Write a protein that binds this ligand. Structure first.
Ligand SMILES: CC(C)c1nc(CN(C)C(=O)N[C@H](C(=O)N[C@@H](Cc2ccccc2)C[C@H](O)[C@H](Cc2ccccc2)NC(=O)OCc2cncs2)C(C)C)cs1
Lengths: 99, 99
């Protein structure tokens, strides 16, 4: 679908059997969630934003259902005031900017 | 323009006679620019993201030229590891997200 930007680009997500809303963020290289339980091993990792750094957990090969689409990729779980879907997943569902 | 997301969505900008490169960021409501010089008086505003918050200067009604499109809007200037064009300016050039 086409998404205008007069409102936050929010999509409904299904991950690890858990439902949540995420922000389609083109300005984000990776995907990050604030509070969801994912199974398996994870690798410590740190990401930076406008505020500073953040210790997150990296999980790979995680099936995520984006707006009705089944995609698999690396998901970061850590302290964030907003759930974000980055370009690492947006390319799998064919997202493109247009103007 | 149709831009895919295999690369960061960067665009060239002419702002206040200065040339910059910015990221088209749908996950940002406001436009943030790291150090540039702008006219007139501002208002000490604070914004947040990953890591925390930051103190910035809020400039209203500043003309920006994105890909040859000239629009006037609010620009925040402050410490930021990357210039960001938010939704406040992206709606001006009719930029949509498609997939
Ligand atoms: C509370 C919540 C419901 C919301 N608040 C807001 C309003 N706010 C504050 C913003 O839009 N703030 C913007 C912002 O940081 N947006 C962010 C999303 C976000 C929003 C709110 C809270 C936390 C993160 C999204 C932006 O694309 C930035 C851009 C960027 C990239 C490199 C270096 C610096 C900056 N992205 C990141 O910092 O991404 C970090 C990463 C996560 N995974 C991989 S990198 C500013 C640039 C203005 C929107 S949703």
């Amino acid at each position: 679908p086409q998404i205008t930007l007069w409102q936050r680009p929010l999509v409904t997500i299904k991950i690890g059997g858990q439902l949540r809303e995420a922000l389609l963020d083109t300005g984000a290289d990776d995907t990050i969630f604030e509070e969801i339980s994912l199974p398996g091993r994870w690798k410590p990792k740190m990401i930076g934003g406008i505020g500073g750094f953040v210790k997150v957990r990296q999980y790979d090969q995680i099936p995520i259902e984006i707006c009705g689409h089944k995609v698999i990729g690396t998901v970061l779980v850590g302290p964030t005031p907003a759930n974000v879907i980055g370009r690492n997943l947006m390319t799998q569902i064919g997202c493109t900017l247009n103007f």
